[PDB]
Amino acid sequence: MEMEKEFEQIDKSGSWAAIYQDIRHEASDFPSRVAKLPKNKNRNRYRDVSPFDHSRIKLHQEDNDYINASLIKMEEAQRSYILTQGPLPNTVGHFWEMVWEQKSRGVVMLNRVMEKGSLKCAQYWPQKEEKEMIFEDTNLKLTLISEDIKSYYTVRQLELENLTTQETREILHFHYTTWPDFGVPESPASFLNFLFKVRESGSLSPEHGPVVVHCSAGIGRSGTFCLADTCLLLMDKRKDPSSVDIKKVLLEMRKFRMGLIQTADQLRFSYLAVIEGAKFIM
Numbered sequence: 001m002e003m004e005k006e007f008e009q010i011d012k013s014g015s016w017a018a019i020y021q022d023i024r025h026e027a028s029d030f031p032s033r034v035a036k037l038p039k040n041k042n043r044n045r046y047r048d049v050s051p052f053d054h055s056r057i058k059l060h061q062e063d064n065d066y067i068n069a070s071l072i073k074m075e076e077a078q079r080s081y082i083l084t085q086g087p088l089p090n091t092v093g094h095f096w097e098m099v100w101e102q103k104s105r106g107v108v109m110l111n112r113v114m115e116k117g118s119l120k121c122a123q124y125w126p127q128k129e130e131k132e133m134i135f136e137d138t139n140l141k142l143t144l145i146s147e148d149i150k151s152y153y154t155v156r157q158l159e160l161e162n163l164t165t166q167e168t169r170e171i172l173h174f175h176y177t178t179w180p181d182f183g184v185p186e187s188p189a190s191f192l193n194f195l196f197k198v199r200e201s202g203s204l205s206p207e208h209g210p211v212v213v214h215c216s217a218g219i220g221r222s223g224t225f226c227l228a229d230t231c232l233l234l235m236d237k238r239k240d241p242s243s244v245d246i247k248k249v250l251l252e253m254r255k256f257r258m259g260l261i262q263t264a265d266q267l268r269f270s271y272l273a274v275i276e277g278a279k280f281i282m
């Protein structure tokens with residue numbers, strides 16, 4: 001079926017939970033043996049969210065190459081994304097090592113450091129120009145260059161230096177700051193505006209390594225971001241935009257990381273975002 005009218009048909013019939021459970025039943029199951037090794041317990045935020053072995057990002061280290069991060073490679077859309085958990089106190093250096101080694105231009109952050117009164121990720125970037133951060137375990141230096149605070153999101157320019165070679169690179173930090181503590185946003189308008197700002201920066205384009213996107217677990221809000229981007233791109237590429245099937249695209253993405261889209265409300269919100277976004281594109 002088309003999307004907008006499949007949408008109204010699920011609303012009128014109140015069957016979002018049943019649609020979402022079908023997705024959960026059909027989703028791929030692949031091994032995640034490296035994630036579950038005992039030496040990696042303090043590298044995982046949640047025991048039930050792990051990268052598959054076949055698609056995990058490897059650190060360029062011989063001691064321990066493990067990080068909770070996955071490469072989502074979308075062949076028809078010609079887009080790639082790295083989806084990862086919010087960094088932990090003992091993985092902030094690994095996180096920036098990955099950004100460096102994978103040649104990413106941008107980092108997309110969809111959560112606040114504290115939500116619901118609890119810490120959802122480490123304070124992994126500097127808040128003042130004159131107070132830079134050094135990660136001694138991976139030999140990197142990170143400096144805040146500029147910051148632009150808007151009503152729904154903040155953009156930061158950061159400098160990442162590989163202290164071993166003295167090479168430097170400019171990284172863009174795109175921080176969506178207004179996702180509610182409970183539920184999903186009422187309108188997709190600010191989320192779409194944010195996606196378009198990431199696109200306009202070049203961070204999603206083939207001349208760079210994959211964008212790094214995270215929330216707390218790296219599967220819920222993060223899944224919504226890449227699912228909406230890929231669906232909208234396919235609607236631009238194909239002769240028949242109504243052929244784009246958001247449930248099929250989501251199942252394709254779940255071949256590369258488990259659990260993408262965590263609730264039926266996130267699924268409904270993804271439909272809403274793609275539907276509204278397709279009208280603005282034209």
Ligand SMILES: CNc1ncccn1
Nearest residue numbers: 076077078079233237
């Ligand atoms: C489908 N995306 C795309 N196509 C051509 C060039 C770049 N991106």
